[PDB]
Amino acid sequence: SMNPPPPETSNPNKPKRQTNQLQYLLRVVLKTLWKHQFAWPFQQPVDAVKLNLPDYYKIIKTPMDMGTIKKRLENNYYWNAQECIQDFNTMFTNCYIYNKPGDDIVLMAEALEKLFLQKINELPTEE
Ligand SMILES: Cn1nnc2ccc(NC(=O)c3nccn3Cc3ccccc3)cc21
Numbered sequence: 001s002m003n004p005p006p007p008e009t010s011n012p013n014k015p016k017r018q019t020n021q022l023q024y025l026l027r028v029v030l031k032t033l034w035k036h037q038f039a040w041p042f043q044q045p046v047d048a049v050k051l052n053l054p055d056y057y058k059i060i061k062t063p064m065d066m067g068t069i070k071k072r073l074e075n076n077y078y079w080n081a082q083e084c085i086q087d088f089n090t091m092f093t094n095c096y097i098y099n100k101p102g103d104d105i106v107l108m109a110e111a112l113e114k115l116f117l118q119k120i121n122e123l124p125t126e127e
Pocket residue numbers: 040041042046051053094095098099104105
């Protein structure tokens with residue numbers, strides 16, 4: 001059970017736009033989550049080989065992490081803020097699916113998710 005390649009982060013064949021909502025997701029949301037005390041395990045794809053989790057990618061077919069989301073924002077991969085919000089939600093849900101409730105990694109994800117939801121509530125309206 002080798003690791004898969006990381007998610008795609010740059011596609012020159014997709015149309016691009018710079019918007020106040022996408023800028024907020026990078027400059028505020030990704031920034032504030034990245035610096036959270038529990039952010040480290042979520043800053044790069046799950047290395048299931050190094051962590052000796054041979055079933056991780058048998059269970060999780062839509063992996064996602066904040067390093068990927070940072071790159072997607074930087075490369076104008078998303079047309080809409082909702083596409084980026086979905087990637088964050090996928091990251092949290094993957095953790096909740098793979099692990100037992102109350103596991104340390106789940107409590108950490110839950111704390112990151114709480115901060116995420118607060119920042120998404122303050123998502124500015126489209127300019
Ligand atoms: C199993 N699991 N389920 N979702 C997960 C999402 C991310 C990680 N990351 C890590 O374990 C990790 N990243 C960098 C270092 N570590 C070691 C470590 C082991 C245990 C707890 C914290 C950190 C595991 C996940």
